[PDB]
Amino acid sequence: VPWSQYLAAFINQIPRLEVALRSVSARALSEEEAARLAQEGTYDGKRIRVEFALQGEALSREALVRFIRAFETSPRFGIEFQGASLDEGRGLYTFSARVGVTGGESGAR
Amino acid sequence: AVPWSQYLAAFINQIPRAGGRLEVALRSVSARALSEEEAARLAQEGTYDGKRIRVEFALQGEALSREALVRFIRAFETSPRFGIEFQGASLDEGRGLYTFSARVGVTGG
Ligand SMILES: [Mg+2]
């Protein structure tokens, strides 16, 4: 099941579309990997538990910049902007990014 | 193990909307894939307008107003790829907003 695409389609349907997602893929980090990343300075040294790898499309440069910034201003998120490309056939930018979320979420167990 | 449904809700709530606002906030978003049998039974039962669903998202959320909740529900009815089953909503008089629950079905497309 192409989960990443279903999750993207579901997120794009939520009414507000300047930034649409193509794929949203989640993984949990080992404590060792989280340790390495915090020390490497990625995600501003926050202790990330979960990473969402994103591929998306932005109708303008400025919409992409707002999207990236939203994940920089929170104590619970970090973002690594991996890249963007102009798509002249569709008049938009494709882009990729990894969003880290700090550990400590609780669930029943 | 990892409470994915909370990390995904938080990620979705972080995606910026115009004005910095969030008229619907998600608290839990769980996904699951349907066996062919279950999709066949749901379709015959008329759930999700008889579309044959491939993935189902179970949602717990909060809506700023009755009108925000109605817009959220309708977003998932006006698309050929989605159906929604609205389970319920309640006014939280401590906060002056609505909690709600719903299931969203997604087609193979
Ligand atoms: Mg709720």
What's A7's domain CATH number? 3.30.70.2830
A60 in Cβ contact with A39 (< 8 Å)? no
Separation between Cα atoms, residue A27 and residue A88, nearest integer Å: 32
Inter-chain CB pairs, A–B, below 8 Å? 76
Q: E strands along B64-96, which residues? A: 82-92
A84 in Cβ contact with A93 (< 8 Å)? yes
Element (H, E) at B13: helix B4-14
Experimental method: X-ray
Q: Which two tokens stand for residue A105?
A: 């979420």
Which structural domain range is residue A47 located in? 1-109
Separation between Cα atoms, residue A12 and residue A8, nearest integer Å: 6
Residue A87: strand pairing partners: A92
**Cα(B27) to centroid(ligand 1), Å:** 6
Nearest to B8 among A26, A28, A69 (CB): A26
Task: Indicate the resolution in Å.
Answer: 2.0
Which residues does chain B have within 8 Å of residue A74's beta carbon, measured at their own beta carbons? Answer: 14
3-state class (DSSP) for residue A14: coil
Query: After which residues does chain A break, using C–N > 2.5 Å?
Result: 16
Sign of CA dihedral A7, A10, A15, A20: positive
Nearest to B75 among A3, A15, A101 (CB): A15
Helices and strands, counts by H and E, chain A: 3, 4
Residue A55: strand pairing partners: A23, A96
Terminal C-alpha separation, chain B = 31
Task: Count structural domains, chain B.
Answer: 1
3-state class (DSSP) for residue B50: helix
Rg for chain A (alpha carbons), in Å?
Answer: 15
A102 in Cβ contact with A46 (< 8 Å)? yes
Among chain B residues, the shortest Cα distance to A66 is held by B16
B55 in Cβ contact with A11 (< 8 Å)? no
3-state class (DSSP) for residue B60: strand
Name the amino acid, one letter, at A71. Answer: F
Neighbours of B53 (CB within 10 A): 22
